[PDB]
Amino acid sequence: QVQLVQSGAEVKKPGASVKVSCKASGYTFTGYYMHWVRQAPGQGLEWMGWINPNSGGTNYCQKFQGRVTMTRDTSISTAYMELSRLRSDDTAVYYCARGKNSDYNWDFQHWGQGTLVTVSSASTKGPSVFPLAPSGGTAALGCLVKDYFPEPVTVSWNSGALTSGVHTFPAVLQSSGLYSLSSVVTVPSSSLGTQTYICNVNHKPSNTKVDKRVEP
Amino acid sequence: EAKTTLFCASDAKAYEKECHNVWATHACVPTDPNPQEVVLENVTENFNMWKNDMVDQMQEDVISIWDQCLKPCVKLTNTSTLTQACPKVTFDPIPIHYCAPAGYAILKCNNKTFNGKGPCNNVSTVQCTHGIKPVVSTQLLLNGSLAEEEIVIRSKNLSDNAKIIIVQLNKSVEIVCTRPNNGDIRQAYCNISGRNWSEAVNQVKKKLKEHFPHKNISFQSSSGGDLEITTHSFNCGGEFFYCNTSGLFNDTISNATIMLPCRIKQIINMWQEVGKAIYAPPIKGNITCKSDITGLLLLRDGCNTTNNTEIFRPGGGDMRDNWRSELYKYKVVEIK
Amino acid sequence: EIVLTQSPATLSLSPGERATLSCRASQSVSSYLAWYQQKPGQAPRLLIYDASNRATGIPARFSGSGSGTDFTLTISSLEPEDFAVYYCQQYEFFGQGTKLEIKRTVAAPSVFIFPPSDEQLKSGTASVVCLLNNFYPREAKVQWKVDNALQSGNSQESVTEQDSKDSTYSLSSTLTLSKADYEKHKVYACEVTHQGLSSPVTKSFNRG
Ligand SMILES: *[C@@H]1O[C@H](CO)[C@@H](O[C@@H]2O[C@H](CO)[C@@H](O[C@@H]3O[C@H](CO[C@H]4O[C@H](CO)[C@@H](O)[C@H](O)[C@@H]4O)[C@@H](O)[C@H](O[C@H]4O[C@H](CO)[C@@H](O)[C@H](O)[C@@H]4O[C@H]4O[C@H](CO)[C@@H](O)[C@H](O)[C@@H]4O)[C@@H]3O)[C@H](O)[C@H]2NC(C)=O)[C@H](O)[C@H]1NC(C)=O
Ligand SMILES: *[C@@H]1O[C@H](CO)[C@@H](O[C@@H]2O[C@H](CO)[C@@H](O)[C@H](O)[C@H]2NC(C)=O)[C@H](O)[C@H]1NC(C)=O
Ligand SMILES: *[C@@H]1O[C@H](CO)[C@@H](O[C@@H]2O[C@H](CO)[C@@H](O)[C@H](O)[C@H]2NC(C)=O)[C@H](O)[C@H]1NC(C)=O
Ligand SMILES: *[C@@H]1O[C@H](CO)[C@@H](O)[C@H](O)[C@H]1NC(C)=O
Ligand SMILES: *[C@@H]1O[C@H](CO)[C@@H](O)[C@H](O)[C@H]1NC(C)=O
Ligand SMILES: *[C@@H]1O[C@H](CO)[C@@H](O)[C@H](O)[C@H]1NC(C)=O
Ligand SMILES: *[C@@H]1O[C@H](CO)[C@@H](O)[C@H](O)[C@H]1NC(C)=O
Ligand SMILES: *[C@@H]1O[C@H](CO)[C@@H](O)[C@H](O)[C@H]1NC(C)=O
Ligand SMILES: *[C@@H]1O[C@H](CO)[C@@H](O)[C@H](O)[C@H]1NC(C)=O
Ligand SMILES: *[C@@H]1O[C@H](CO)[C@@H](O)[C@H](O)[C@H]1NC(C)=O
């Protein structure tokens, strides 16, 4: 039972810094190097550096030399990765990882859950829901959760009643720096007048809970 | 190709009060006045400095030397707290020969450029190693053996940026570290020739470039860690010096004298085990050590470069590498 | 440099078949290669280490082989949960991964369109939506056009992950314009090309 548990998500303005923590359990924290690897949304894994928790020695990916710092607290079996002078590029999920054995530490057998770090000058803001009304057979209708920040956004239909045939699409980052998604559902024409259709949009950051109605 | 209990020999004096002598006279036998070196004709044998139980045995021996010599006033670990008397002692490492018992011998590689791992064709057999001083230090290897031909690079795997790189020079550089007195009793300084050091760095850079052709070789300071590995740390006359080596690991090494500021410290992170050791304040007087830099401990920055440059920074901390820098040429073998 | 080139970029197969992913090291590197699996939302999972050693809990159908510069991961009798992203690793260097997708029969997209709402127009801008529903394969060419005046430069799209039931995809395209620029033209249209549609379908509306 080896366990690596990382701190929670972070939202940051450019030029700021962020420190992610990684608490280890189930082994001798000082006997294995700890690596940090980031993954941008929709991209590959990028190695940043490792730290020897015994002496605190570090090795940083040359791309981050100068603005990345790795440290450790042995009394709590915790490793820290601080990235400074942030920018939109640094938006990614940051993982701590540990190899399988002491000899060879690059076969990353143990990973943390990851810590999502979002970087953008934008500020918190709740969404503004809009109806996508339809017009025999089976039609479609949806909501357009538009202009909100930061992610995520939870969508349901008729208080979780309508589920089958529902599709909530991934968000997209607009030129304005605000996210926007759409959530649609397919329903037969034998119900676009008798059955009512309401969305349920929950945006935790802005404490927003909206219920928009969709009708022809 | 076997494992056995080595023993130790030395020129220690039974009347000498220096602590290394007091330990060796009790634990080591005299130096065999008639060393028998047998050169095995037309024989190639494998060596592996990175998997050599001799290193572990020397680690244990130096741990014992220090448990007798540098007894801390306080010792703090994960699971224990120790308070005890901590009297100052005379301190000066003496050479120690490591010998195999009956039914065993020590294979010695005589290839003067062997990097410590792989086949060696210039093999001989001995009963003991040459004299090895148990010098504890980081970043700079002191008072060791020089390379007889040209600078030698040693790494369990140079392609692995997490593996230490042991450099053996073929021409030592003198470093004179002194804490003077009549102020600040914990302030000291090292002097080193900038011309000789720059020449040594340039030669090491060429030899490293041989393994990273087309690349500029850069020397920079440690990227972090305990003060033990971010400075040149070492024990001189019983006092723990931590010396700032920013002026040594440099792309702009001056050709004139180089002065390194040092601090004498009482709280130290132990290399014998995970924990802290608190010693008493420094003794009074002029504390001096004129030592021979004969090696380096380096680590290479990871990732691909974007300005065509491999970066090397001083490392250390695990004193098994200090012992490897001297035991690379040896192996314990059973007669059969 | 040292580069790991994984191929193919995407691999579509059916359950029960055998998958073969390749990873090329830009220079000889002996046999220190690892293979990882990654699901959406999860951390990478070590499958192979030292080119051929199966990590703990890795079933037998996973196999790793190769040496020098060419390495391969082989998955016999693909199961539903074996579809994911697969990465190769050499020290600190990662390959860009190959995505293993489920292969199924070609499906036609049930296309729909949605005009901007009045509440949205009452703010400043207008957003027109076009939906492609449950289709396979993923590739689809969406083209917004005011009848003959085709649009480019401000339509953003999104695609769902392969549905766990019918192994299909779905796409949403949003065309964002100004309220005035919206009320200027009249006939707004959304055409689509897909491997399951014989001719380009163009379900659309006009501003009235
Ligand atoms: C890397 O290697 C170098 C060289 O091997 C090493 O430097 C050497 O350090 C040792 C100890 O620090 C030096 O040995 C000491 O030298 C002083 C001065 O030398 C005098 O000796 C002659 C007599 O032959 C004098 O006539 C003349 O004036 C010289 O100046 C000696 O004074 C020291 O004697 C003490 O230790 C003896 C142990 O046998 C005692 O018997 C004696 O009574 C002295 O004890 C008292 O004085 C000590 C010095 O003040 C004091 O520390 C004690 O606590 C006690 O009060 C001693 O022999 C040696 O000369 C250095 N050699 C060179 C070439 O510099 C580095 O230290 C080493 N590096 C590392 C990191 O280990
Ligand atoms: C060793 O001494 C140098 C001498 O300045 C210290 O230099 C720091 O690092 C560079 C200068 O080379 C600058 O970015 C820092 O601002 C310097 N800090 C100073 C001068 O206080 C270096 O920090 C010292 N290292 C240790 C471990 O003490
Ligand atoms: C050290 O690690 C390398 C990994 O790159 C192993 O592979 C050698 O790599 C070097 C540098 O690219 C090549 O020149 C060699 O041809 C590679 N060897 C083989 C057999 O392909 C190398 O084997 C490792 N060495 C040791 C002693 O472990
Ligand atoms: C050492 O680390 C922590 C104390 O900070 C403790 O949980 C762990 O069990 C200890 N184990 C050993 C072997 O020291
Ligand atoms: C020592 O070993 C190296 C590497 O195997 C070899 O190139 C060299 O020729 C050897 N030295 C002698 C004197 O044979
Ligand atoms: C092997 O080592 C011995 C050491 O005594 C040396 O005399 C001899 O010349 C070496 N062999 C070769 C071929 O150099
Ligand atoms: C030490 O080795 C280097 C090769 O890196 C060579 O240039 C230099 O002349 C050698 N010095 C001595 C004293 O042998
Ligand atoms: C450099 O080393 C030589 C011996 O090889 C020595 O004579 C010279 O004095 C040293 N340089 C300085 C500046 O002392
Ligand atoms: C080390 O480099 C710095 C700047 O790069 C320079 O100021 C300093 O003089 C150098 N040290 C030596 C000993 O040349
Ligand atoms: C190349 O870039 C690295 C990244 O910081 C830097 O440390 C190094 O000094 C650069 N090489 C030069 C300036 O020659």
Author numbering:
A (entry chain H): 1 to 52, 52A, 53 to 82, 82A, 82B, 82C, 83 to 100, 100A, ...
B (entry chain G): 47 to 123, 197 to 301, 324 to 396, 412 to 492
C (entry chain L): 1 to 91, 96 to 103, 106 to 214
Quote the paper.
The HIV-1 envelope (Env) glycoprotein is a class-I fusion protein responsible for host attachment and fusion of the viral and cellular membranes. Following expression, Env trimerizes and undergoes furin-mediated cleavage to yield non-covalent gp120-gp41 pre-fusion trimers anchored in the viral membrane. The VRC01-class of bnAbs is of particular interest for HIV-1 vaccine development due to the exceptional potency and breadth of several of its well-characterized members. To better understand the potential avenues of elicitation of VRC01-class bnAbs, we structurally characterized complexes between VRC01GL and two clade C Env constructs using a combination of cryo-electron microscopy (cryoEM) and X-ray crystallography.
To better understand the molecular rationale of these observations with the monomeric 426c core construct, we engineered a disulfide-linked 426c core†-VRC01GL complex containing all wild-type NLGSs (426c core†-VRC01GL). We co-expressed these proteins using HEK293 GnTI-/- cells, which lack N-acetyl-glucosaminyltransferase I activity and thus are unable to generate complex N-linked carbohydrates. We then determined its crystal structure at 2.3 Å resolution after endoglycosidase H (EndoH) treatment to facilitate crystallization. Despite harboring an NLGS, no glycan density could be resolved at position Asn460 in either of the two molecules of the asymmetric unit. Instead, the Asn460 side chain is hydrogen bonded to the backbone amide and carbonyl groups of the VRC01GL light-chain residue, Ile02 (Ile02LC). We observed electron density for the proximal GlcNAc linked to Asn463 in one of the two molecules of the asymmetric unit of the 426c core†-VRC01GL crystal structure and cross-validated the presence of this post-translational modification using LC-MS/MS. The crystal structure of the disulfide engineered 426c core†-VRC01GL complex expressed in GnTi-/- cells further reveals the presence of a resolved glycan at position Asn276 in one of the two molecules of the asymmetric unit, indicating VRC01GL bound to both Asn276 glycosylated and unglycosylated species. Analysis of this structure highlights distinct sets of interactions observed between the light chains of VRC01GL or VRC01MAT and glycan Asn276, which is rotated ~90˚ when comparing the two structures. The 426c core†-VRC01GL crystal structure does not resolve ordered mannose rings at position Asn276, despite their high detected abundance by LC-MS/MS, and thus only the two proximal GlcNAc moieties were modeled in our structure. In summary, VRC01GL bound a 426c core with wild-type NLGSs, was sterically compatible with glycans present at positions Asn276 and Asn463, and strictly interacted with a subspecies of gp120 lacking a glycan at position Asn460.
